[PDB]
């Protein structure tokens, strides 16, 4: 199936409390695999996935040097944006970036992307054509021009189509046992009483990987999507995810409702009842 290499970057200024905090967190699909935190006792790029032990010392030194270079670059960016927006030096501000590429099952690039945000709002983004930028405001229009004159889009395209793709393939290979596995979810239903002769039936799905899953409740064969409670799929601390979906039904009518779980680790979907 498709796979992706994504980096979530954050730069937050802490006026009065010293230098801003800088963080890089990398992901291959739903798995965190590398991280850098400027607040760390010893700021170094560190592995977050066991399979990353296959990379030599030179890998960690290079990535650490780049991250520190990025830290300095974003320190300046925070100052620059105060100018663009005419903001005072005393406030805390945030720059967020999501950068990455995705390859199909055969390892060829499907798409590459890069998007910036300032204080929680879109700032500038690379367009699907990987050649042009789109600014969310006049400030971003300043950056757009700078980048066009520096030929930045070409440099980024080189990375997205090259480095990003090749390293993504490499990570998928070295960590294939972890990244290409499939953990089948284990599901169960809980019952909770409520006032006015009604009950809450909750359908739980635990220990699955990849994170993609579909949990639905049905009555008369119709899926009750509109009348359904649900949490976003969440990591459970060991590389797997969980999710639950609930429905409040009339007391004594619980047996007319079934929970269905669809996941790639299930040849046939699970059907549960209380």
């Amino acid at each position: 199936g498709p796979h992706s290499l994504r980096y979530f970057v954050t730069a937050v200024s802490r006026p009065g409390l010293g230098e801003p905090r800088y963080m890089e967190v990398g992901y291959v699909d739903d798995t965190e695999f590398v991280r850098f935190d400027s607040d760390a006792e010893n700021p170094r790029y560190e592995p977050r996935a066991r399979w990353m032990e296959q990379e030599g010392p030179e890998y960690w030194e290079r990535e650490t040097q780049k991250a520190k270079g990025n830290e300095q670059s974003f320190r300046v960016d925070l100052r620059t944006l105060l100018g663009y927006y005419n903001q005072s030096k005393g406030g805390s501000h945030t720059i967020q970036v999501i950068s990455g590429c995705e390859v199909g099952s055969d390892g060829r690039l499907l798409r590459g992307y890069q998007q910036y945000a300032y204080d929680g709002c879109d700032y500038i983004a690379l367009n699907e054509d990987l050649k042009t930028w789109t600014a969310a405001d006049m400030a971003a229009l300043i950056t757009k021009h700078k980048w066009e004159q520096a030929g930045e889009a070409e440099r980024l395209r080189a990375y997205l189509e090259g480095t990003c793709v090749e390293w993504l393939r490499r990570y998928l290979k070295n960590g294939n046992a972890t990244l290409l596995r499939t953990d089948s979810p284990k599901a169960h239903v809980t019952h909770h009483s409520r006032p006015e002769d009604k009950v809450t039936l909750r359908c739980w799905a635990l220990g699955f990987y990849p994170a993609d899953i579909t949990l639905t409740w049905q009555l008369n064969g119709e899926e009750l999507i509109q009348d359904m409670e649900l949490v976003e799929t969440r990591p459970a601390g060991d590389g797997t995810f969980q999710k639950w979906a609930s429905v409040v039904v009339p007391l004594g009518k619980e047996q007319y409702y079934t929970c269905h779980v669809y996941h790639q680790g299930l040849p046939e979907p699970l059907t549960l009842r209380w």
């Binding site: 990398g26 991250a67 720059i95 890069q114 700078k146 980024l156 480095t163």
Partner: peptide, 8 residues
């Protein structure tokens, strides 16, 4: 492998 970002 991360990218070396350009300044804004």
């Amino acid at each position: 492998r991360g990218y070396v970002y350009q300044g804004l």
